[PDB]
Paper text:
In the other six substrate-bound complex structures of S209A/H333A, clear electron density also could be observed for SM, AM, CE, and TrM, but the density for BM and TM were relatively poor. Superimposing the seven sulfonylurea complex structures showed that residues involved in the formation of the active pocket are almost completely superimposed, indicating that these residues do not undergo conformational changes when binding to different ligands. Furthermore, the aromatic ring of these seven sulfonylureas is also well-superposed, indicating that this moiety strongly interacted with SulE. However, their sulfonylurea bridge and heterocyclic moiety are not well superimposed except for MM and CE, implying that this moiety is not tightly anchored on SulE.
SulE catalyzes the de-esterification of a variety of sulfonylurea herbicides, such as MM, BM, SM, TM, TrM, EM, and CE, to the corresponding herbicidal-inactive parent acid. The structures show that SulE is a dimer with a lid loop in a domain-swapped β-hairpin covering the active site from the opposing monomer. SulE shows a similar catalytic triad consisting of Ser209, His333, and Glu232 at its active site.
Numbering used by the authors:
A (entry chain A), B (entry chain B): 12 to 360
Write the structure that this text describes.
């Protein structure tokens, strides 16, 4: 069902700061080409979209895209099926979707001069990085190599171009400033639930430690593990005996303990190997990253928490990629998210 | 005023091309940091959002943001009132809103290396340009100088931070490729109406000459005038005796003549001076730019066209900025757009 009844919808900007150019602005002088003279620039602000149903129940959901992505991934699948935005408005939740600072409708901080440079100050780096189609194919576990699908894949085959077109670079905005923008949104919204993805997994955990309004977290395929400072457990290298997973983020235990106060679920798709896989770097990377997360969740539970790991194949769902919420079985994935919300009273007023 | 009922909503990517790096991709080697080796990159694609009401009447509308903007400006005003997207879904049109290539959820073409550079190929320039708050203030005619408002302004005063946060830079993607993406969208949609703004004014005129599915154009404060090649009229320099308006775009007459086959309306807000204003560069720029547009429309009409210029003050609306569709009286501005659609039957099936 594609029908949606909205009590209200819209979008707004929140967060960010300003930086200023030298000198002063004279309205008599030519304004184009643009100049940094007398300039105030708003930087690192975030775009926020909301849709509210009639008669909402439970807490609003904040959907937070993964690395190099935008709120598009919650709007629609690459083959044009409804995304989680529609599904959960239909499930009677108010739904927020964001484009974080540096992505999509969020701000890209650049000026008049080499990319990211304001006179002598580097606001973000001029040198960018960006995944290729090939890198994203194996990162997202469509298959073991570009152009090849796992036999069981839930990916919407035939819509590869549409899928990869949604991805792009991120400028070097500090993670602190990205977290700051979402903390400010959570302050504005009130009690809510964060639903994160890959790169935004660790960022959402950080937000919750700064914002008691976060009443629950569901993280799809989180990319970076988090631990109390000085208590990172032994994590093996990858099967190539050369590479490591992403260095785990370390926070003061007084902040880490806040994660034990809310229900947290990490969700993983399929085709993560059980055993070392030296021929396929990202598959092996996901094996060790998932392992590190299991230990992170265990640490939260030793502090009295309620942190769980859901492998979708254990729930009867086979073949999901690293984007289970846009896969062909996304309605079933959504049902499992509704189950988590219902278990924890997050779908009741 | 806020309730909206959608038969369906969603988003998708369209247009663009691919560029490739050197070499071959090896899935056994570390995928992060990302590399251009063996890489395929999707570049210059466009993001498209659609909202369809139940039982649409008349043609779909394609809202095309101005320079440095995104589809946000059609979603909500800076103070959170409904934008034209909501207003015209309520008016029973299917509504498309785009983020053009290079803006918002559209692609920003950059790779692993200095911004915009793929090995030895410069896809877009590493040196960017971007407006300041101060430049945008006078560009958009909030007032004659930053901090000042014209009397009777319809700007949503107090929401300056929200407003300027929606603006940003555009990489040097060729205008040809931006036009190409929207031609592809118009082919996909079928007969439609383009609603353009400032920088997308001339781009929408170009699309219409390439796409018979464009059945009408309403252009809010277009920034560049368009003429048949070799027949640009005499246009005076600005009052500073030094500057000129944007060089008018010239197209072959065979293509220009296609503009005479559809209704076209240019819409201007308030406070464009009638006489030279040497003290206020952008006010004088708008005076001469609007004059050039009056000549462009007269050229369309001499070829048998249906082109008109609507000054909102002549319709009884005073104080509009260069973004009349997000001003305080935007409902009244919308009513005038509904009037144009009804006059030409573009609101009937
Ligand atoms: C410690 C990080 O260091 C680092 N350095 C560089 N270059 C120096 N690049 C990166 N890139 C990413 O993290 N990519 S990623 O896209 O966010 C991602 C990665 C893994 C798994 C998933 C994702 C993801 O979100 O899939 C949607 N990371
Ligand atoms: C032939 C132009 O050459 C040129 N050169 C440079 N730098 C060398 N910069 C520009 N910038 C713009 O055109 N800005 S603009 O934002 O699109 C714009 C302008 C005027 C009026 C309105 C707008 C606008 O859309 O307001 C939302 N133009």
């Amino acid at each position: 069902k594609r029908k949606v009844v909205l009590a209200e919808q819209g979008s707004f900007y929140i967060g960010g700061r300003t930086v200023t150019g030298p000198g002063k602005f004279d309205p008599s002088k030519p304004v184009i080409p643009y100049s940094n003279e007398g300039a105030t620039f708003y930087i690192n602000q975030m775009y926020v979209n909301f849709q509210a149903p009639v008669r909402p129940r439970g807490l609003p959901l904040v959907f937070w895209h993964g690395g190099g992505l935008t709120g598009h991934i919650w709007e629609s699948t690459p083959d044009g099926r409804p995304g989680f935005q529609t599904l959960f408005v239909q499930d009677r939740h108010t739904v927020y979707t964001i484009d974080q600072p540096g992505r999509g409708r969020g701000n890209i901080p650049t000026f008049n001069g080499p990319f990211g440079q304001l006179e002598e100050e580097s606001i973000v780096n001029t040198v960018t990085g960006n995944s290729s189609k090939e890198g994203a194919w194996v990162r997202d576990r469509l298959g073991p190599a570009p152009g090849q699908f796992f036999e069981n894949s839930q990916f919407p085959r035939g819509y590869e171009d549409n899928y990869f077109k949604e991805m792009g670079f991120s400028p070097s905005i500090s993670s602190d400033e990205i977290v700051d923008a979402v903390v400010k949104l959570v302050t504005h919204i009130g009690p809510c639930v964060l639903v994160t993805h890959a790169a935004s997994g660790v960022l959402g955990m950080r937000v919750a430690t700064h914002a008691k309004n976060v009443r629950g977290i569901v993280a799809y395929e989180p990319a970076t593990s988090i631990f109390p400072k000085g208590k990172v457990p032994e994590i093996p290298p990858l099967a190539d005996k050369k590479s490591q997973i992403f260095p785990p983020f370390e926070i003061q235990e007084s902040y880490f303990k806040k994660l034990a106060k809310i229900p947290i679920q990490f969700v993983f798709g399929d085709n993560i190997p059980k055993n070392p896989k030296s021929a396929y770097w990202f598959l092996d990377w996901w094996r060790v990253t998932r392992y590190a997360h299991s230990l992170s969740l265990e640490a939260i539970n030793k502090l009295g928490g309620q942190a769980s790991l859901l492998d979708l194949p254990t729930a009867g769902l086979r073949g999901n990629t690293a984007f289970p919420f846009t896969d062909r079985n996304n309605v079933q994935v959504a049902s499992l998210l509704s189950d988590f919300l219902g278990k924890h009273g997050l779908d009741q007023n």
